[PDB]
Write a protein that binds this ligand. Structure first.
Ligand code: BCL
Ligand code: BCL
Ligand code: BCL
Ligand code: A1ELD
Ligand code: A1ELD
Ligand code: A1ELD
Ligand code: A1ELD
Ligand code: A1ELD
Ligand code: A1ELD
Ligand code: A1ELD
Ligand code: A1ELD
Ligand code: A1ELD
Lengths: 47, 48, 48, 47, 48, 47, 48, 47, 48, 47, 48, 47, 48, 48, 48, 47, 47, 47
């Protein structure tokens, strides 16, 4: 709960960074899904 | 089994810029591959 | 969920120059791709 | 508050940098929208 | 034998980003090789 | 035990990193096997 | 808002040389693109 | 005021650098405008 | 003689990542050379 | 013995690293021999 | 306005070598462009 | 005056470096003008 | 004369990895040159 | 004006190796340009 | 005049690896130029 | 003797590194001679 | 005199480094002039 | 004498490195002369 690791961070900080990356990844995935649906509709791909 | 503990051993200042660079390069690579290997996307650029 | 906290773990001196380089290279890549894959913008350069 | 992180910055400074990036991104987006409208008008693209 | 001891002599901050770069570049290389050396995957991009 | 090596880590930490790499490698292998089965089904590769 | 505060977080010794390199490479890129994609400026070099 | 930031500079110094870059960009812009006028006159571009 | 003593003069953190990079690049080079200089392995990719 | 060298390691640690590299090289060689036998059987090479 | 004060913020040891590299590369680029895009200077090399 | 900036130099030294660059630029410009005159005379360029 | 004394002036951690890189790249260069400039070794790869 | 005072602001360890690198690269570039853009020096290598 | 005094201002650890790299690359460049610009040494490789 | 040089090594250590490089070079030369004999026998080179 | 600059050198040291560079450039120029005379004599250049 | 320069070496050590480089270059020149004689004899160069 208080240990400082060689990188200079604690477990809570490292887990916060991980949760942040996961949340940004979900937003990116949503935008990518929308873009892929638009590409399927418009571009001559997958049909 | 928390993968976030990787940030306790690899500093975010070193790895996060690397993955941002890799994300940018990968997106540019997908776009370039589709641009090169298709007739459309290159006719969409051309227009009429 | 504040994305400014990325600057508490990644030094702005490391990430901001990298993202500026990415912005410049991406703009140059869009311009180069359009230059290569179109007849105009290359005829606009040529003029008459 | 008044807490120094491994990068040497506080939360307020990091959030100010974030707001700065967001403001510059909006100005860039406005200029890019104007440029894309001009491209649509003048170039043979999307026509 | 215990290969984890490779992290007692090589800092993870130096080696782990390198192998992440290796993963990214190797996957891109496999995809690029298949793209270049096949007619499909390049016709799948083209569609119809 | 409790010994700090030139990298600044102990044996337990180094083995934890190894176990994590092995676990992530197994997840990656599972996804790769699924992707290769899909490729075999959907592509002309391997007849 | 004051963008000069970008120098309170990004060292000028790191960003200013990078932007000078960007300016030089961008000017050379414009010149090279016009050189490649036109008949003049390449006939101006040729003379008569 | 009289505050040293993680880069080792104060607000006045950072704003002086910004004013310097802005002042130089205007001389660069003037020379670029003159060069573009000369290019328009002498080259087949925009004609 | 004892070649492990090289690790008393060359830090493993510097040499081991370099040799890992060499191994990866050498395997990729063998695969790429065989891909380029043969009709099979490029027809195995093609399938039927 | 107990002597620390410029890299920060002792003779025993340096020899352990050497033994580790040698041990891994043999597994790599075994997998490579299996792969080369499979290549000889399946590919037109050496035929 | 004194443009020498940039050396109070950008270390000369960092910027001066960079600008020397820029000068060399720019001169070589002009020479190479003229070499490639002309018949003379390439016939002057050939002589008779 | 007598102030040391983050680069380790005073204003007098920074202005000396600027004056040196400006002085060398003039000799470079003179040699370049001579070279361009010789090129105009001896090459098909501008004729 | 004793050339080992170079290690008293050039640190082995800097020069030994460089010479290992040189050895690897030189061997790969010999192999690549023979591959490119011969009909065999490229027909040995092809087999029959 | 003593141009030797450039070493009071730029460390020789940074500029002298760099200028040696440009000397080598420029000599190689002149040789390569002459080799590529002429018929002799490429017929002198061939001999008879 | 004693050129060895160049090592009192440029550390041998910085310059000597650079000149070794230059020597290796220059020898490889001579060999590559002879290989490319001749029919022999490329017929000597293939033999008969 | 017992003198530490700017690299942090004594003369005996530097000479040990030299002898090691020479011994490894001889082993490499032997393997290379065997490989060149095999190449001469099998490849059309020198024939 | 006796003043140490940010590079760690005094003015006399930098000046004699400059004199050394000039002497080396003069020797290089002599060899280059000889090489250019030989090239003019032997190669089909300037003829 | 006994003066330590910014590189951490004395003049005697720097002159020793210079003499070593000269001796190595002489050996390299001898081998290169032998190789060039062999090339002249065996290759169509200079014939
Ligand atoms: C493709 C068909 C169109 C076209 C339509 C598009 C569309 C649509 C858009 C652009 C965009 C841009 N186009 Mg375009 N564009 C065309 C042709 C051109 C040509 C040309 C040669 O014809 C020029 C030069 C441009 C230029 C530009 C810029 C105005 C802008 C790039 C934004 C960017 O990301 O910059 C990145 C930056 C760089 C590449 C260089 C960075 C410069 C830095 C800042 C230099 C700093 C100097 C430093 C202070 C010096 C320090 C010195 C030391 C202190 C000593 N285009 C044509 C004809 N273009 C976009 C835009 O407006 O975004 C705002 C946009 O949306
Ligand atoms: C050439 C004709 C043959 C063939 C015959 C040969 C022969 C003969 C051999 C191989 C060898 C290999 N071949 Mg092959 N091979 C063929 C076609 C392929 C194709 C394909 C697309 O068809 C694949 C993918 C492979 C793959 C392989 C590997 C199994 C192996 C490479 C060894 C190596 O050095 O890896 C280098 C490693 C890499 C390139 C990637 C490294 C991966 C690293 C470890 C990733 C680490 C991840 C890290 C933990 C992630 C960290 C993330 C953060 C913590 C967040 N081959 C064909 C058809 N091949 C060899 C072998 O088996 O040696 C063991 C071997 O002997
Ligand atoms: C050219 C016509 C001939 C031929 C004749 C020649 C002749 C003649 C010679 C060779 C030589 C070699 N040839 Mg050949 N060779 C041919 C075709 C091949 C082919 C092939 C695909 O067919 C292979 C793979 C080889 C391979 C080789 C090697 C055995 C050797 C390279 C020496 C060297 O400098 O290595 C450099 C090293 C590398 C390139 C890779 C380095 C590997 C490192 C050590 C990996 C370390 C891994 C590390 C421990 C992992 C760390 C992981 C972390 C700790 C996690 N040749 C053909 C058919 N070849 C030479 C030799 O035998 O020298 C000894 C030699 O004299
Ligand atoms: C080569 O051939 C071709 C054709 C190209 C095919 C090959 C393609 C290949 C091989 C691969 C393709 C693609 C690929 C894979 O594989 C893509 C993966 C994309 C991913 C995972 C994107 C993820 C994005 C995540 C982002 C942007 C996260 C940002 C988070 C930020 C900035 C901050 C978050 C936060 C933090 C820190 C603190 C919290 O308090 C608050 C909060 C705000 C939450
Ligand atoms: C490869 O194939 C092709 C054809 C190229 C297609 C592929 C294209 C692809 C994949 C992508 C394309 C483009 C893309 C994406 O994706 C672009 C995104 C652009 C963005 C986000 C630009 C943003 C710019 C923001 C800027 C300049 C902000 C600057 C702010 C600064 C300097 C300072 C602000 C401030 C600060 C700090 C402190 C405050 O006190 C005061 C204040 C002044 C506020
Ligand atoms: C060149 O020609 C072509 C055609 C391309 C053919 C050539 C192909 C070749 C040569 C090779 C191809 C491929 C290849 C090989 O070889 C691939 C190998 C892939 C591998 C090994 C992937 C492995 C992934 C592992 C991952 C992502 C692990 C992540 C673990 C993480 C992030 C963290 C875990 C954890 C840690 C640490 C700390 C704990 O506190 C908590 C815990 C959660 C436990
Ligand atoms: C790729 O396809 C092609 C065809 C190329 C098309 C693509 C083109 C694209 C994408 C982009 C093109 C161009 C572009 C964008 O976008 C250009 C922008 C240029 C700019 C902004 C230049 C600015 C220059 C500013 C300079 C040199 C300022 C210098 C100031 C200095 C050195 C010092 C000032 C001072 C300081 C510090 C201290 C004070 O006390 C005193 C003072 C003296 C004041
Ligand atoms: C260019 O033209 C072409 C066609 C390509 C032909 C050219 C080809 C050429 C020139 C060369 C080809 C190949 C080659 C030429 O050598 C290959 C050599 C491969 C080798 C030597 C691989 C070796 C791998 C070794 C590995 C992975 C070892 C790992 C060990 C690890 C990570 C750890 C071990 C351990 C340690 C530390 C601590 C202990 O407590 C416990 C233990 C677990 C033990
Ligand atoms: C593809 O497009 C092609 C065809 C390439 C065309 C495009 C070309 C383009 C875009 C650009 C071309 C060229 C260009 C631009 O733009 C050139 C500019 C050149 C310049 C500015 C050169 C300047 C040189 C200055 C020098 C060498 C100064 C040296 C001074 C020194 C070493 C020292 C002086 C001194 C100092 C410090 C300390 C004092 O105590 C003593 C003192 C002695 C005073
Ligand atoms: C470009 O055109 C082509 C066609 C390619 C032609 C051009 C080719 C050219 C220009 C050149 C070709 C090749 C060439 C040149 O020139 C090759 C030279 C190879 C050499 C010198 C290899 C030497 C290898 C030595 C090795 C591996 C030594 C390792 C020793 C180690 C790791 C350790 C030893 C030890 C030490 C430290 C401590 C002791 O206690 C114990 C001991 C164990 C002893
Ligand atoms: C594509 O375009 C092509 C075709 C390439 C044509 C374009 C070509 C272009 C643009 C340019 C070409 C060439 C060029 C320009 O411009 C060349 C200039 C070369 C010069 C200046 C070489 C100089 C060398 C000087 C040397 C080696 C000096 C070394 C001195 C040393 C090591 C030491 C000396 C000493 C010191 C320190 C201490 C003292 O106590 C004792 C002393 C011993 C004195
Ligand atoms: C581009 O177009 C082509 C066709 C390629 C033509 C172009 C070619 C061009 C431009 C140039 C070509 C070549 C060239 C130029 O110019 C070559 C020069 C080679 C030279 C100078 C090689 C020198 C080697 C010297 C060596 C290896 C010395 C090593 C000494 C060592 C390691 C140690 C010695 C010692 C020391 C320290 C301590 C003492 O106690 C004991 C002692 C043991 C003494």
């Amino acid at each position: 709960d208080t240990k400082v690791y060689p990188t200079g961070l604690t477990e809570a900080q490292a887990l916060e960074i991980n949760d942040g990356l996961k949340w940004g990844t979900r937003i990116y995935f949503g935008i990518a899904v929308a873009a892929h649906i638009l590409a399927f509709i418009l571009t001559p791909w997958l049909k | 089994m928390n993968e976030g503990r990787i940030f306790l051993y690899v500093s975010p200042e070193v790895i996060l810029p690397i993955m941002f660079l890799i994300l940018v390069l990968t997106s540019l690579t997908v776009h370039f591959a589709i641009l090169i290997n298709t007739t459309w996307f290159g006719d969409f650029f051309q227009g009429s």
